[PDB]
């Protein structure tokens, strides 16, 4: 038999999650725009996530706590209480829609972050990102529409008194059959699409980032090795072959160079051409001197280009790590309740002899599974503080 002790536990953890999730989101929203060197594409989406959670925690928690302390909804005997029976599902599901769609947009943006890595960007929030977040907000709000309608306050009798209880009651055929498929709708929209999309896009990113670096290493290594071969050559044929390989390498490396370094590659090709001409004329030593002339240009321009490129791609990845860590934490938090509801609907059998005690267990786990989902609303700040490695200094400052 369920006791009131678990009710007190629920109300105290609700009061705690309120405090934990309020100030953290508030301070993240303060930071995202207070510091000048902070605003960019993904950070605006993170701020949208935080605001979507903040609305929920600032509106819905202080009615849930009372509903648990008492046994009735607020304002049952007043007409205005009718309004505060349809906002509750609307906000609570709009928040989740916003979060899921924002995570998917982050995954797509992070994949585009390395698909034309040569191309450089500017500063501030891009033009497309603002309309993207507006579209996400409006689409989530619109998709959340079929939950507020039909949620009616139904009368009931207790102790010889007529009171109200808020529930979904049939009104029309479409929402009647919607009352029978919405459970599958939630599991297929808020849990199936985002995980698959993020996993699929994550793998494509991992593939691209890998090849590029391999191509860069191949070009640099073939340059160095052919220079080493020419250093101690003996005949014109080998010098010509090695210089041909070096010219092909220089052209292929320049093709991948974004628009200072292009001037360096043009000078490199010019010196290679001079060496090739001297070799073709029929001399060896002059070719050796011309090849030796390449060392200064190699040690002045190309090394710095290789350094920067590697370092930049390191940074690009860190951002992907924070995004997909958020995705995995969301999936972990939201899995248990959906599994519990699906299993209760499907595998539960009325004819089972031991169906009571099992249910006595099952309800209990569900009575925490819901709570787990709620905790997600306040897990975003802390996870950002131990992962981003840049929000750490922002919070400390």
């Amino acid at each position, epitope marked *: 038999k369920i006791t009131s002790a678990f009710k007190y536990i629920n109300t105290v953890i609700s009061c705690t999650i309120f405090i934990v999730g309020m100030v953290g989101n508030a301070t993240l929203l303060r930071i995202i725009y207070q510091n000048k060197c902070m605003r960019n594409g993904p950070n605006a989406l993170i701020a949208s996530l935080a605001l979507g959670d903040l609305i929920y925690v600032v509106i819905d928690l202080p009615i849930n706590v009372f509903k648990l302390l008492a046994g009735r909804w607020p304002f049952d005997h007043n007409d205005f209480g009718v309004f505060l029976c349809k906002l509750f599902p609307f906000l609570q599901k709009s928040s989740v829609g916003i979060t899921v769609l924002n995570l998917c947009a982050l995954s797509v943006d992070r994949y585009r972050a390395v698909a034309s890595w040569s191309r450089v960007q500017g500063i501030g929030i891009p033009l497309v990102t603002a309309i993207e977040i507006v579209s996400i907000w409006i689409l989530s709000f619109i998709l959340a529409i079929p939950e507020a309608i039909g949620f009616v306050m139904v009368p009931f009798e207790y102790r010889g008194e007529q009171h109200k209880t808020c529930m979904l009651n049939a009104t029309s055929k479409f929402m009647e059959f919607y009352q029978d498929v919405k459970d599958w709708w939630l599991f297929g929209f808020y849990f199936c699409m985002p995980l698959v999309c993020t996993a699929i896009f994550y793998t494509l990113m991992t593939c691209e980032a890998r090849r590029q670096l391999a191509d860069l290493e191949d070009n640099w290594e073939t340059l160095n090795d052919n220079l080493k071969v020419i250093e101690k050559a003996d005949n014109a044929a080998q010098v010509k072959d090695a210089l*041909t390989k070096m010219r*092909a390498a220089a*052209l292929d490396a320049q*093709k991948a160079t974004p628009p200072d370094f292009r001037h360096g590659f*043009d000078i490199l090709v*010019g010196q290679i051409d001079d060496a090739l001409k001297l070799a073709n004329e029929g001399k060896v030593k002059e070719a050796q001197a011309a090849a030796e002339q390449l060392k200064t240009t190699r040690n002045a321009y190309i090394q710095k280009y290789l350094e920067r490129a590697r370092s930049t791609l390191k940074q690009r990845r860190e951002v992907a790590k924070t995004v997909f860590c958020l995705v995995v934490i969301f999936a972990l938090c939201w899995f248990p309740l959906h599994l519990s509801r699906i299993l209760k609907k499907t595998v539960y059998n009325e004819m089972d002899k031991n169906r009571c005690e099992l249910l006595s267990f099952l309800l209990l786990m569900d009575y925490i599974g819901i709570n787990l989902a709620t905790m997600n609303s306040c897990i975003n700040p802390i996870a950002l503080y131990f992962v981003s490695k840049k929000f750490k200094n922002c919070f400390q400052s």
Partner: antibody
């Protein structure tokens, strides 16, 4: 307009001599490199020789080395190809072509303008 | 030295079809390849640069593509003027220039 013309074709005996001229109108030859291309009757396209008069750099093909000489004249804006000691498989159609210099697009522009072509036949 | 091979020697295609010609390089040249068209009794004229680039005035039906050391020329619509011989050339350096054998396109019957 950019135009290339060729002259100096006819009938020669084996082991004879010939001198072909390629003239250009519409551009200077010091801003480009001049190449010669050969097509045998009913065969493919073959490379022969090239010259660059900005630096005076010339090169030939292995099958025509030691018997063909190439030169340029920047006063008359022309290129010349002298052939000596010809053999049976030297009958073909000859074409003139231009190529740009490296630092920029014109190098990627490859062969742009071709000449009309001159038929050279050797027989006894 | 740098040999370069054309697979299809002759194509029999009719008006309104697409054609694809593949040219393969022996060594690993860069995108430095070019495509040329020749009709009988005339000098060659060129269509495609850098393995993907259209010349000035050539119809936009001709397209080129590169993948490693394989180069593809594709024509989407076969107008009657497009019956001639085609060549693929590499131009990595002045003294290293190699031409393909040639592909002839004729009418079907």
């Amino acid at each position: 307009e950019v135009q290339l013309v060729e002259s100096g074709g006819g009938l020669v005996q084996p082991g004879g001599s010939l001198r072909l001229s390629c003239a250009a109108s519409g551009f200077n030859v010091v801003d480009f490199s001049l190449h010669w291309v050969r097509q045998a009757p009913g065969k493919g396209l073959e490379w022969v020789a090239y010259i660059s008069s900005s630096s005076g750099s010339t090169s030939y093909a292995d099958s025509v080395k030691g018997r063909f000489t190439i030169s340029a004249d920047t006063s008359k804006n022309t290129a010349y190809l002298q052939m000596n000691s010809l053999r049976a498989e030297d009958t073909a159609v000859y074409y003139c072509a231009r190529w740009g210099y490296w630092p920029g697009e014109p190098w990627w522009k490859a062969f742009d303008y071709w000449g009309q072509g001159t038929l050279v036949t050797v027989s006894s | 030295d740098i040999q370069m091979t054309q697979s299809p020697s002759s194509l029999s295609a009719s008006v309104g079809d697409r054609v694809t010609i593949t040219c393969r390089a022996s060594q690993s040249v860069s995108s430095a390849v070019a495509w040329y068209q020749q009709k009988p009794g005339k000098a060659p004229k060129l269509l495609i640069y850098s393995a993907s680039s259209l010349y000035s005035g050539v119809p936009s039906r001709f397209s080129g593509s590169r993948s490693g050391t394989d180069f593809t020329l594709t024509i989407s619509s076969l107008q009657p003027e497009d019956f001639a011989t085609y060549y693929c050339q590499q131009y990595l350096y002045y003294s290293l220039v190699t031409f393909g054998q040639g592909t002839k396109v004729e009418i079907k019957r």
